[model samples]
Target: GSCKGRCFELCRCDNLCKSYTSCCHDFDELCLKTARGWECTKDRCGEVRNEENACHCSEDCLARGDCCTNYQVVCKGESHWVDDDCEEIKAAECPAGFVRPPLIIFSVDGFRASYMKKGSKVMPNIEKLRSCGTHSPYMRPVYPTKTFPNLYTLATGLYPESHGIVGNSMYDPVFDATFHLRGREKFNHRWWGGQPLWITATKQGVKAGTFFWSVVIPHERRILTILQWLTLPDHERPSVYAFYSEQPDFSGHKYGPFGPEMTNPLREIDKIVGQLMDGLKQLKLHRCVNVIFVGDHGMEDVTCDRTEFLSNYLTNVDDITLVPGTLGRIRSKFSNNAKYDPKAIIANLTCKKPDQHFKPYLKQHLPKRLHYANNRRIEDIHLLVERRWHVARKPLDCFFQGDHGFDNKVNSMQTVFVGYGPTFKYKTKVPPFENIELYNVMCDLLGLKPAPNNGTHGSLNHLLRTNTFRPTMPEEVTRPNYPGIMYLQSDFDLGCTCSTEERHLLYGRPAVLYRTRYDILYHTDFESGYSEIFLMPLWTSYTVSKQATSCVRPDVRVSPSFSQNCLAYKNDKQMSYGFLFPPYLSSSPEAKYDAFLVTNMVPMYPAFKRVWNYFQRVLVKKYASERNGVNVISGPIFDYDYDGLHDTEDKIKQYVEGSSIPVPTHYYSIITSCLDFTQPADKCDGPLSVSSFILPHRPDNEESCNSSEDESKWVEELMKMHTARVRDIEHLTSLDFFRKTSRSYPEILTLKTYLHTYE
Candidate 1:
């Protein structure tokens, strides 16, 4: 027998089709079958994704086709099960103790997929697993994207809305019980519906255990008291051990998702991974146990002052119970009984509001995409506020700095998915899928049939060694058009490409092809299309266009402690057009092309606002669709030509936070148009159109630069202002926006005619 013959027993075909099971070897055989049956399939954005775990890049996804809708963010750790390394086993040392490897499903809350690409510097073991195991960098979660709902879905293979744990803080009209965080009620599981994997394993005569809920702090010592769970023996050890840490998620809520707190917790969590491996190494069970790491959801930044207070609308909020989340649940005090008219409550939260801060809907009227109905737990008049805008009783009640609980369609709300052990394929980076698929995969690993659930079994079977479980789904689950590059965390932390000090998260990290979110392509057929508007940012620095405000409420969140708690809302008559979020009726055209694409954190101060809001009106609006749509990179520029680089930091510190955060001296934008964005990122078949703008930040300017855009002399006034080229912006920021592209873009960017602010 030839050696190659046996080695590749299943390596018969690369193209998905009947041939993989047979021998047609037909080059174009399509493997993924849909409800419609395979006719011609688009490569989920030209990436490898199996049928079971794909996204519904269809109308179902609120973000259109732009989000990594598949559940993607992924997980391990601790030498204390937080500080040690592993010993490589070469000669098959550990004796087989069980029928299969022990399975561990570890979930670190708030560990987002964006972190894998952008927040990964602190994560070495998980990254190594990504290098040697199977993972999706941008996994999508179920709608509402909360912890309790998502976690149960991971354990039971059902959507949050389907499983009934719809919100972290829930109210059940059935028994009149309330599920909320803090004080007395933390010990109840009545709100959780569906059979969790652990409870299921117990039913099937297999040992399963759970330890720790969010935070390193052990919320309780078993009513008793390193805690006793770690001391449990191998036989007593859980066949399915699940651990949940409030890492990064905890810090994210307390200090904003993009601050020092976010970066610090990750290191500690990474160390904890080291701890888990050491335990396996000490017990000599590395190969016998499988580990599935994941996050419940991601965090977004919220401004301290901006809020949608429910009491502002309703005559008496006392008649309703408000659950804390992006969507405020306004239930009548008369639960299980309809004493009050939902119409008036809906009117108060909807039409009766003074300003446009929230979108009010009846529980049954909620968008089908959000899967928020069907379960009676969701309140009567649900108040879905603008993106990142908090829902509180009074304006000041909006206290937390970072938040989540928006639709899972938002990329920032997506978690990560990863599996490592004896069964997973080696070194494969697959595309993402929904959280429900994990249940089927786990049931297969644990050797049991899951309770009738929402997911298709074996949907992700290819990720494993044996074709163990078959998936169940009547529709397409994989997200379409995931360009792979639109995967970076904006302004939340430093990008892989930026430089920084040890104190700065970007210090040692450098951007590369897979880890970076940028792409290189000719600008020809670029259409101003493709954005999952539901993929909302916690905060946006500038107003992109009137269309931006049309859908996404202009995000106006700020760090609780930022600006020494002054909570700057200094919008005077001077800044009329693009002061806050969403867009204005007169929004600049440049603001329209893929509105949520670049850094949305430019408005910390009005310094950039002057130039920030103005240019989008005058320039971007004029050229975005020339070829088709455009690619824009806009962010703050911190630099030395600053007249005083370090000194400015000191001055700004004294004037601003004393808070000591990095303050860019300038703000820059690089715009490029293309005929189409469907082609590969580097494909240059189409022609291109390029332009750049470098606006200096004037901390001195309390109002946005175009505060006078309302003036009759706006455009005329802008045309005469001083301007700079893309080359100058690069020099000032020590950056190469399109580093791989030419100094060649310059010839294409020189203008026939140009202007400054929209005014």
Candidate 2:
């Protein structure tokens, strides 16, 4: 080692060589990166800490170790060395041993999916990220589509129903306290349910820094704060950072979406993103860090012209606790009050106007796809508001120009998602998925095992370059094959769709005496009574249990013939392929997907199906779920002439123009439960609790289901009129249930003759 002077083997020209000038050649080039061994280099005072050198010259050199040997002379002067390196760091690089890229999450509040194109034009930086990395057309938000609920769902990967933050304004009956977005109650951890990503990170040995709303900084400062975090030494640096910005969302609420007021804020947000990216590049950390940009929820324009006033229908709006917005939640003010009637409220509000923009439903009656029910924080009466409409408790001259917290399914409610950096697939596009699936993806990016979250782990795997974890999925539950019911049809290809002595079916399987061959098909939670001749299920037999709490179709293992290619129904505006056993009845997502199969669908007029939905979902389902449970046998009834008699051969030959599937003139259901519901369905020896209905499958122009102060009186009256005995349903369908089984004739006669009374 020779340059100007000969190098000594004992005293190598390294970091400690500055103290002794008997150094070797190339000393300055090899060791002067920082002040050598406790020596001060004024130029290196605020520079990134150089670990290769023995002495530290950076701002945090004091407590981290000894600073330059100059006793507080050059850099800090007379002031103490304040460990201020982590403060407002403008430039930094990844430290040695920090090879795994850091993850930075940016949440742009109220950035709707529709605004992406507009924002992209003005925001060249985000557009650049979008062009280079993976982005979604739009990420679907959770139900209620509010800031607090959806944002938390994005952070925790659990639905709002599971995460306990049901809305921005919440009244927990258990806590008997209220949580408001404007109040200090947001700090109360008790109100928050799942583990947020920050906590998920730090608990797993990966450090995290958060810039969420509660502790947010200005846009300019957020970039500086992130730089500050990036500049920290290895052990102290946060590998995961969550930054929040209020932008177009703030402007959106003030001036509505697509307004001129959005121009500056959108540009400002883009500038901030650009500044952060530029800073990372300057420090040469751009490729070593992952950045995911997302919007919490979306915004919709709301005006007085599209507003619905609750005061118009209710005698006294004050009697109920109302949380108003696109989602109008109504709770009984006093839970202890004897007259607290949600049904009465629903009766008053349901279908009140000819062109009503909102529909009132019991929490249980809300669409199953929404997943809004089952949470205690959810109010009793949920008003499903149509898009572009606002629900107001009192009449207002003008409303907020923009609003959200509507159903998540609304197109305007979907938000944007863009992810960039090393681990992401370059220049890729991903399909829109629930925001709940993001947490697992984030955890994978940070290389931390995620907490137990509701998100399916591999659902968003397409967005990554290489999977960090193997995909996890639940094992399929094995179903039973009923030999007794399936024996006779064994000679033919009778699919095992029917379950015998299964808890889902009551008494026995509805034995179909087919002159022609038929196939039976079974599903996860329910069985389909498919007819080979009809090319659709004759009936769907399944149980609705109070305790039956909780998807890939077209697997090669599943027979393709069992499925109907019913995309044909899309062309006909009046007809919808209604589910024989709707998915909402079961909590399992698999069962929901099972219900989506075409084999489970029957052609029905939309208007007729709406009324049909009320009876099945509201009347029978609530009635049955309130009890232990009930066995339901629902199917299409061919009563073609508008006459009371069931149609035979020629009438059954009629089809829905394009398909072999026959159009049913009427639909029927036989709901049965044991007299002792305390005992399971199979063990019931007592008199059965039976109810049967035959709904006329015709289009209805009636806008409202008439009310009786506490219930839908018209639907109840219609159910009463449509009520039939077991024998009548048997004669109509030519399917024997109890008598076909090993039951005594006298017992079967008594059971078949009974007609259920309705209120």
Candidate 3:
């Protein structure tokens, strides 16, 4: 017999299916064929069919005639047999006397309370965790809001003033030197005076580990584990610490607090937390640990074009100098004699001073009612301008768009603080607290004593038991001076030139103008007569040809030579004069070709007109020869003048030679009038005067001679001939020939020279 709804492989006849109940068996055995029918069979298949007569088979029944008898028995198959009413067994449970885990201190570098409070969708992990822990509505930072200083305050339960870590980079007044904690090996207990909470816990015989904490340099006393900046991989960064992982915060590399680039860090932090949980479980410490995460300071949008209040007050200085630094801010310097000094200079504007003597001078010269401060390490005066007022030596070209190096009263000072521990009251808003208060909270959570400092720790105690944190009343808060000072025009105007009067107003002294001439001719082998000239007021004399010869010209065709012909002369009134002469031109025919004088005093109008007239007269005369019998006169030749016919051939000949003569003849007239007579007459006076030269003929060699080696000798002689022709034209018709002309006489002469040489 088989059990109901059970297969033969698993059913047990002795368990539920027995002979009295519905059962079946093989035909050779003593069993029923149907539910109620019974039968008994022998080895010969001819057996008795009775309930009682179905005999009980003995152990030796097979050998005897009793084999046909039936007997009830429980058969055991290869499968197990069980009682009708049976139950399964259960497993054991975990042991007792287990301790809850220790607390975790999670520190994020640049998280902002405002960003979290705004319910930003980007940081879902941080937001979700806020529901399970206490979060501050707003956290205030310690004075001098910088990274290293604020981080020290967080760990040490003290302000920078008490902790003695006043800045990212600080000058040790006692040591008389500067110490930087960033990339230097000078970490010591003295530099970090207050004992951090981790150290305090370790002193009390508890193990503590630091993963990239700022001032956690290992010493012999407290730290169980220390990972210095040196331990961080150069390129590859692990997503999780494998110890106590928290959500990654991207404030470190993201240009601003909650920018888009922060997502990667946040994701990495999530993985780190997950791995940390796995590790805790493996170590049997998952239930015992309490984790508390806090951010040092909130980030502000900064740009390379930061508003520099110091540049605005640097009006009257002359030597506008700049000192470069990491944060894209510059320290400027100017002479005392700069113009326009405003009184009441804003204080703490820049990072450096102007000059010692100019400080007092600024107070006297500037207006009396100004609100400016004068600090030597800053601009000569300070300007507390509005936000986004880009104040730089030049416009900023870097990526940062938020900044917080201003007064602590600014809104950018707000940061964030969050704690999730076994003792923390869940799903509660902690009251607004100072960043220094975090030190006491960490100490209390780790079961350590609080150190003395200007900061108070009462707020941490309030947050542990209740949701007492609320936004401060608007009426209770006194708004800072210059609130909502949105970016306005910067007070400092960088890269502006100061006038002489303005210089005197700021520096209390007159500006000294120095004169020097750079004879570039010696530096190259090129025609160097004022090839280019640049004028700079505050010039620094530099001999650029230091490694090479001083007289090496800048070009190959011209001699590499330079001569110092600079002569400075001062006048009693406003103007002064200086002269620079070419060294080789003194003996050259073009020695009188003084380019400096010509460039300085060339009569701008006549030089233009004479050249134009020369070309027009020459062109018209040539056109007349090509068109014979076609009257090409300046005015109408009327019929009343036709008493006798002038032969066209003879007239054309006269016109060609005569008209052509005026073109070259006018050349002398142009030169004489353009010559400078203000200088000594001997400078330009010679037989090369206009009246002595013949028409249509080049000047005599002796008369035209000035000297040899003159590069401009040809142009000077051409001018002499053009000047004589002008005089000849004036004598012939009593008409002035040297008028501004557009005709390109010089270009024509160049063409003729090229053609003549080629021919």
Candidate 4:
């Protein structure tokens, strides 16, 4: 049609047509068709075929297309938010369409927690994991805190007695067997009872593999194996991998705990860990795998002369089984009464050389806290040696400097646990909890049912990223977000002061101010030297140094050390005092302000958090600028709702943490920024912007303010969140921010709208 200078209704030569449907060539099978009749098809399929065209075009075998769809999870690193599933990820062993992530558990035997607790830059890998994921300096080993029992406990998550392996040398009368480390009992499958994570992993259809070295000869070979496993085709790789290192145990047992011997091994382990990280990224396995590094029990020093044997005490040789080695046990022989006299014998036959070096107890009388009794395998008599002492038949030349298998309560028996990768929380430091809890955490990440065991969710649930992570609105973040949405105030209000014994306790509650660089108001030095404390405006409050700077950090310890992104109380302490604003604004910024400034105010932290988030994330980035910085007055307000809290007037000013401070029931802020910076807030005369809000000082099930394209929506959102007029603010706070300013702007005094037009 264009060739003829007129648009054509239809064309015979060409038009939009199906790929393979075309007309015949010169004179034969027409693979190409005319636009008049594009019934394209490989009609030549049945007839003698000439040179084939690109398979019925792209749309031909297009008869039924291939579906190569894929999906990936958006990880938020929150606790209880596991990205793993029942499907096997190393070739994903699930029903279909789901995949589990790889998990690696590394156990370093005899590595004491105190090694890292010394506060030195001890282990580089330990440091890296602490910063990258969750960590615990102290992990309690199982009762007796022995290697095998605790190692197995770490493996199966069962108490030693619950699993059949109760001690280094366990004698089961029912099975008529005695298991000792040096003997064949070591590898006897019958000696191990509890279902370890490795086997449990397989029970649920996941691939589990292990390369443990109570010694580190071939080194990263075991680590490399997992890397190779990752490289394998999906069908061939395993899902869970575990490894145990032996150096620290060997060094500690040989040279006692915490010396260079013990500390040196840590350095080597650190190097290998660096390699693992490198390989993970090198192979891109970082996203698909989670790694946990820990230890099984710890070592204590036991010198050469501390051993005590029980044979010397027995008068009747036939009445007793040969009293076992150092830190020994004595079993009464088969008899009608079946009892042995350990106490009377110890008094008469034991030496006082070291005094209480070897202590005796009837097996039936062992401490309940140890959880060692009530098992058939434990015999008639049980014995203990003082710290660093062991029961032996004779003293020797090679001094036994260290050994474990003692009361688990000893501080030395504690060990370290650290983790990396998506399965764990980031930059978290948790208090010590029993090691038995690791079981369920693994089960969660691998999406497998944990076997019946002593482990509980209470032990380690909070440490997982999947369990703790929750998304925050871009605006609700702790610091300024330039590229993302800024916090929205649907209604902006200007918003902070203090004194009195009643206020003293509350004075340090927080000083939630913005950073100095951005605000040009935060004060003093830049290092920890933030005047971290900011006072709140009391009902008849403490005086404000009207001369004070705007939203700045309050400092003490002349500004103490705060390494993490979170907040903490003042340094000098009787009560340790209230908090300081967080160093990182990226966290819950508003909450930090609340937590940093005020001590006890219900739901305030969460509520203030959301509101500020809206301002910074939704509103500022969406609107304000430095030239015409938005104006705001934010402070606590109260006209008690007589609501969820103890609201009676008499109860209104009650205390928190035994202090005389009061919690505010509401908070308000008024903010407005017009095109001109010189105009009084109310007399914007030209085009003006204004919005004010008074929200209950309590947390609500409020989602973050999602941004939108429409400017009017921003105004509507804030107005809906308990909007109020400047007149209403005057009625409530009794403080006037605008004197003659708002008289000319009566129209905006009580109304809420996106923008204003000059009348």
Using TM-score as the measure, the top candidate is 2
CA deviation > 4 Å runs, candidate 2: 1-95, 119-121, 213-216, 335-339, 396-399, 482-759
Pick the lDDT winner.
Answer: 2
Kindly indicate the candidate among 3 and 4 with the higher lDDT. 4
Which residue window of length 10 is worst by lDDT in model 2?
80-89
Off by over 4 Å in 3: 1-101, 117-124, 185-189, 211-258, 281-284, 309-312, 315-397, 465-759
RMSD of each: 24.6, 20.7, 40.1, 27.6
What TM-scores do the predictions have?
0.49, 0.57, 0.37, 0.47
Question: Across residues 1-759, which tens digit of lDDT does each residue of candidate 1 receive?
Answer: 122211111134211112214433332222221232211134333333333332222322222221121211110111222223443322223345564556777788887667776545677766766666678766667767778788878888876766777877877767777776553453555666788887788898887654442232232211111112223444654566666776778788888777776766887776566545544543445555677888888878777676767766767766666775587777666545555777776655544423466677655444323446667777666766666677777554644788788756566777788887777666677656677778877888878778977664544665677655442212322222323233223323221121112111111111221111222211111211111221212111221221224122121222222211112122232211122122332234664432322223223454335455555554554443333334454544444323211122333432223323344444455555433544322233454444555444554331123433452334323222223344344334333333233323322222201112221
Off by over 4 Å in 1: 1-94, 119-121, 183-189, 211-235, 334-339, 351-355, 396-399, 470-759
Question: For model 2, how does the per-residue alpha-carbon lDDT over 1-759 read when each residue is reduced to its tens digit?
Answer: 643332111145322243423456565543333325434567677777664664556777554433443324466564222111112222224547684788989898899887778864687778777777789888878888888888899889887888899888988888878998776677778999989888888788887765452232235544554665576667777788777777778889889987888888888887677657655653457666888999988988877678888899988777777787788888876657776777678778867765788888767545334556667778868888888987878774253688887777667888999987777877888756678878999989988788887665665667888677764222222222222232222232322232433666655556664343344566667776666566666667887765551121222222444344444465556666577877677657655777665567678887776677677678766766655677788887775432234566476755665655677866788887776778655456666677787765655523244542333656666566456666556656666666333444544544564545332
Candidate 1 vs candidate 4: the TM-score winner is 1
For residues 88-179, what per-residue lDDT tens digits would candidate 4 score against the true structure? 22232232322667888878888787777553455655565655667876787877677778878888877777787877877788778788
lDDT of candidate model 2 versus the reference: 0.67
